[PDB]
A paper describes a structure:
Cryo-EM analysis revealed that S17R37 formed a major polymorph, termed S17R37C, representing 70% of usable particles, and a minor polymorph, termed S17R37N, representing 20% of usable particles. S17R37C and S17R37N were both determined to resolutions of 2.4 Å. Additionally, two S17R37C protofilaments form a symmetric double helix fibril polymorph in 10% of usable particles. The S17R37C polymorph core spans the residues Y69-Q132, encompassing a longer core region than that in the S17R4C amyloid. S17R37C contains six β-strands, with residual weak electron densities observed, likely corresponding to an unidentified peptide on the N-terminal region (red arrow). The S17R37C backbone adopts an S-shaped fold centered around a long β-strand spanning the region K102-Q114. Similar to the S17R4C amyloid, a fuzzy coat was observed on the N-terminal side of the S17R37C polymorph (red arrow), although its electron density was weaker than that in S17R4C amyloid. This result suggests that the N-terminal region in S17R37C amyloid is more dynamic and/or less compact than that in S17R4C fibrils. Additionally, the residues spanning N105-Q132 in S17R37C form inter-layer hydrogen bonds. Perhaps most importantly, the PrD-C core regions of the S17R4C and S17R37C fibrils either partially overlap or border on the Ssa1/Sis1-binding site (T143-K164), respectively, which explains the previously observed resistance to chaperone-mediated fragmentation.
Numbering used by the authors:
A (entry chain E), B (entry chain C), C (entry chain A), D (entry chain B), E (entry chain D): 69 to 133
Write the structure that this text describes.
Amino acid sequence: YQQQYNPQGGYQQYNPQGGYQQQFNPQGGRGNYKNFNYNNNLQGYQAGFQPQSQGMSLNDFQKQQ
Amino acid sequence: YQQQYNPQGGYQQYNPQGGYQQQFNPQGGRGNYKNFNYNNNLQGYQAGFQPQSQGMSLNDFQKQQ
Amino acid sequence: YQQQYNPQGGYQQYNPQGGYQQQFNPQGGRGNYKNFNYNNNLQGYQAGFQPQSQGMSLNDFQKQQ
Amino acid sequence: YQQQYNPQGGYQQYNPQGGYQQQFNPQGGRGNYKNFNYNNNLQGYQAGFQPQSQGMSLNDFQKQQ
Amino acid sequence: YQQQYNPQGGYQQYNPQGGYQQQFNPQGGRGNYKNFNYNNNLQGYQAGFQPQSQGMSLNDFQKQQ
């Protein structure tokens, strides 16, 4: 079993952009706001050696009883 | 079993863009807001060696009883 | 079993765009809003070696009882 | 068993666009809104070596009892 | 068993467009809205080596009992 990653040269720009500005933005409103959940996740790889790997794992969240 | 990844040269720009501005934006409203769940996830790979891998895994979320 | 990925040169721009601005945008409304779930997921690969891999897996979500 | 992917040169622009602006947009309305589920998923590959792979898998979601 | 993918040169623009603006847009209405499910999925491949692969798999969703 032989796994070989051998890059030569190259230009790599890794620029993921997440803009979350004013996620909660009511304008001129009247009322009540209860149980607001914001989950913002950014994950990634620039090149790299990662067999049998997992980027992001999320479970059991954002529940109201 | 032989796995070989050998890139030579090249220009790679990795620019995923997520815009979440004003996700919750009521304008001039009256009422009540309960149990708001926002799940924002960005994941990726620029090149890389990752056999038998998983990008993003999500389960058991956003439930109201 | 021989697997070989050997790219030479080339120009690759990876630019997926997700625009989620004002996802929830009532204008001049009256009422009640309960159990709003927004799932926004962006995932991908620019090049890369990933046999037997999975991009995104989601299960058991957005349920109201 | 021999699998060979060897691209030479070329110009590749990967630009999938998802516009989700004002997904929920009632204008001048009166009422009640309950159990709104929005699932927005964008996934893809620019080039890459991925035999026996799966892009996106989703099950068991958006149910009301 | 020999599988060979060797593209030379070429110009490839991958631009799938999904417009989901104002998916839910009642105008000047009165009533009640319950159990609204919107599933928006965009998936694809620009080039790439992927025998025995699956783009998108979805099951067991959008059910009301």
